[PDB]
Curated annotation (Swiss-Prot), chains A, B:
<feature type="modified residue" description="Phosphoserine">
    <location>
        <position position="3"/>
    </location>
</feature>
<comment type="function">
    <text>Plays a role in the nuclear pore complex (NPC) assembly and/or maintenance. May anchor nucleoporins, but not NUP153 and TPR, to the NPC. During renal development, regulates podocyte migration and proliferation through SMAD4 signaling.</text>
</comment>
<feature type="modified residue" description="Phosphoserine">
    <location>
        <position position="26"/>
    </location>
</feature>
<feature type="modified residue" description="Phosphoserine">
    <location>
        <position position="31"/>
    </location>
</feature>
<comment type="subunit">
    <text>(Microbial infection) Interacts with SARS-CoV translation inhibitor nsp1; this interaction may disrupt nuclear pore function.</text>
</comment>
<comment type="similarity">
    <text>Belongs to the nucleoporin interacting component (NIC) family.</text>
</comment>
<comment type="subunit">
    <text>Part of the nuclear pore complex (NPC). Component of the p62 complex, a complex composed of NUP62 and NUP54. Forms a complex with NUP35, NUP155, NUP205 and lamin B; the interaction with NUP35 is direct. Does not interact with TPR. Interacts with SMAD4 and IPO7; translocates SMAD4 to the nucleus through the NPC upon BMP7 stimulation resulting in activation of SMAD4 signaling.</text>
</comment>
<feature type="modified residue" description="Phosphoserine">
    <location>
        <position position="17"/>
    </location>
</feature>
<feature type="modified residue" description="Phosphoserine">
    <location>
        <position position="23"/>
    </location>
</feature>
<protein>
    <recommendedName>
        <fullName>Nuclear pore complex protein Nup93</fullName>
    </recommendedName>
</protein>
Amino acid sequence: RTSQETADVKASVLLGSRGLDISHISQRLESLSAATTFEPLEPVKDTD
Amino acid sequence: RTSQETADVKASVLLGSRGLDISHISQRLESLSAATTFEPLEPVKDTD
């Protein structure tokens, strides 16, 4: 229905009228997909 | 320094916080690049 070629811009006109930035939230969601917090510390499936 | 993929978004957040839309100004600047007007009929000015 909507081309992605205009999406984040039109969403930012609509939601920026209410004080939201789509770009800082996307650039956070990029860091939230690069932040390797992980525990290689305990023994996978010791059991049965 | 800034990707154009987020430019009009970040500009609309910053200037929308001050009461400016960008979308209506861009659509005006498109009409101001399509408006072939000239009204070609000046009446004669000054006297030598």
